[model samples]
Target: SIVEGRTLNVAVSPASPPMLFKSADGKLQGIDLELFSSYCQSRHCKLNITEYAWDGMLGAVASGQADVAFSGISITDKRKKVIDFSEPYYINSFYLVSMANHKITLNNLNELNKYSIGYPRGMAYSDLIKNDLEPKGYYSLSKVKLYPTYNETMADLKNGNLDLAFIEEPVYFTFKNKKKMPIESRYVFKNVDQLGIAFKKGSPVRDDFNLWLKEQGPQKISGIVDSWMKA
Candidate 1:
């Protein structure tokens, strides 16, 4: 699909800050935006972005309405069934966010069971949390409050409604200095969630996009990721 008179449609979520978000001018801007732009340029194709909720972004691509989903979508077994994925762009380490002044140490699995935690729904984080703390016979954390968005979970933490929030390290880095909230970068689980580009299964663009992605190079990729974390 990279020949003359062809274009790529990219679907993304603007609600998630820094990763893939809408700019103040009502245009799409973020890490995925930059990377995808560069990738398309390498393929000599035009890119048309379609904004969608995180929930529907993947569905759009799966249904063939979009060529690819460039959102901050995590790769998991369930998702693998619906689409093909590029090499992982990032491996995320989950963190616990709390009041900056509070003293909380989660050195062991039991520690997580003692608190009320919130995380975004339909994320690998919930599964990671359950797998880590549940088998220890600590079902208290079995009921992780699920929010539709990460900001909502963070807002609850800011409002003192949640004891802790599970967030990716990059996301935590962005909020750490701004929120003034005590953040814990505990290795609560050995599982690392990977973020990558998603395309419908058997999409013709998959191989071409992966090749273009690699041409972006490691340093450029690192810079894009660093920019997001620092944002």
Candidate 2:
């Protein structure tokens, strides 16, 4: 069986947008939902979905309570130890956003020193900057400003108090809807992380889905991604 009893039992926490989230009407929709829905269709099978909190979603898959789990799930070394991952469907990257009218851009890493960077305190940008940029004299830890969240970080950027704000690809797109701010991505650090579907340790569906991805090819996959990115 590709999954337990032909139907894939899915555990989800639908909060991440573009990848997975609910519509205003509370309908389940997004790139992950559509991709998996079509995958099931290809196999002539069905899906049984249940919502759970983030930790509970993964736990359900790990303990055999659910066949698979997904909610913009990242494939990390620690998470890989607990659950298997399909090939990375999305490579999450961080971007430095600035006001479009500022006409500021990063032509090179050395240019980082000239700009003020701010973001939510717990963002991954700090680790990269501390380990990579700081060591190379490209940026200093003292220059890495922190805020309570994107709200404050973006507010400062809008208020012209901050030059650049850090955010990931999904959040960047989420903010694309607003024209009042006229924000633009000045630079992006790619492949910082990648999102994948979480499967049980020995689920046959894992490999099946992997091969299905291969057969579909990258162009087709990116087409789906591009369609959603524009949506």
Candidate 3:
């Protein structure tokens, strides 16, 4: 019913660079937009993209404010309880970025606890920090800081306020291209994460999307991702 005549409402937060963000002209553009718009066109439906905060995009879908949401959303078991997700379109891993000239390099998660580490609040990295990293060492919780966004976390790291920060590899590429901050990847997480489109629990729209995902082969998907990385 919601997908009949009205434009397909896509809730996105343009804060995740390279995935979804405002362009120089303030238009929403990125890999996520490209993927969503392509899918919408296949359905002969217009895409009506709505920008929301990263924290609230899920709620927008859950509350029926949008038909679907995708902005580098990770498909996790914890999130599956409330929202349904389509087949994953992308896989990503977290990397630890620090000053390029730092005296020491972080080779493992245990080594990170010795220094003040920061990550975006509400991100999966924060969960790993608390549940996985902290429990294994004498590192105090005070060493872990949460920022509002990855940009802020990187800023503090460059300014020497934070020893290191965890960010997605794709996001690191964007920051690398901009060259505002001089940082390098020190370590990569072993666990990989899958990014997927989201819908309200029991929404049949996800089934259609899953079908579409299968029809779109890996090479085509790779082209979309590679183009964005080069952009």
Candidate 4:
């Protein structure tokens, strides 16, 4: 929760990597981390981060343990009901990732009807697929396998353990640059998800933060992400 003397505690999920994750050395480092630091600096506020499980991050804000949560959170209807989201900081598109020799196109939903799809736990892609296809009997994806990070999920996809893995395009781009594992992406699903910062529903900080967020456009956010993720 917001401390009385101009300090804010931010909750971040430990599972999201390259966006928000606990490094091997136990330091919080990722795109969101840098963004928050700069934001706090500009706002003249001291920022404290508390890491929690993916599902528990928002609850921390609701329960007053965190003033807000910033870890590349996606805007969704269910989340909007409980917590507030700031202006979008990044855009994400989900796609099907397959091995090079699969010889199948995932440009349509029908192509994924029989495949076991994978994605990170608590991500929008999991919600999207589960909401759309699970009840139709056309797709067999009951649940998405959770990985500590997107890289792990992609690694599983590359190793043939998963038929396909669904992930955001930014993350896919990051991995494709790093791994070069002959993996291919097919735009079977399309969504322009706007990632944002999260705060307790109706918190006063929401308005103030949203105002500041709008000043940074796509190009600014993209540049920050690129710089932080560079080798």
| Model 1 bad stretches (over 4 Å) | 1-5, 130-132, 138-142, 178-191
Encode model 1's per-residue lDDT on 66-103: one tens digit a residue: 87897677788777888888887887666767766555
lDDT (Cα, 0-100) at 15 in candidate 1:
61
lDDT by residue (tens digit), candidate 3, 56-162: 78778878788788888888777788789988777888887788878657555567657777887767775565566668873545667888778788889888998
Query: What lDDT would candidate 1 get against the real structure?
Result: 0.72
Question: 2 or 3: which has the higher TM-score?
Answer: 3
lDDT of candidates 1 onward, in order: 0.72, 0.81, 0.78, 0.72
- Which numbered prediction scores highest in TM-score against the true structure? 3
Q: Kindly report which residue pairs in candidate 4 clash with one another.
A: 1-66
By summed lDDT, which 10 consecutive residues of candidate 2 come out lowest?
Answer: 172-181
lDDT of 2 by residue, 27-121 (tens): 99888888888788888878899998666787898897998888777787666777898999988998889998888868989998999999766
Select the stronger candidate by lDDT from 2 and 4. 2
For all the candidates, what are their Cα RMSDs to the real structure?
A: 2.7, 4.6, 2.3, 3.1
Q: Worst ten-residue run, lDDT, model 4?
A: 137-146
Model 2: colliding residue pairs: none
TM-score of each: 0.85, 0.68, 0.89, 0.82
Each prediction's total of clashing residue pairs, residues at least 3 apart in sequence or on different chains, is 3, 0, 0, 1
Residue 129 displacement (Å), model 1: 3.2
By descending lDDT, how would the candidates be arranged?
Answer: 2, 3, 1, 4
Q: At residue 33, what lDDT does model 4 achieve?
A: 78
Q: What's the residue-level lDDT of 145 in candidate 2?
A: 80
Q: Model 4: runs farther than 4 Å from truth?
A: 1-5, 14-17, 21-26, 135-137, 140-144, 215-222, 225-231
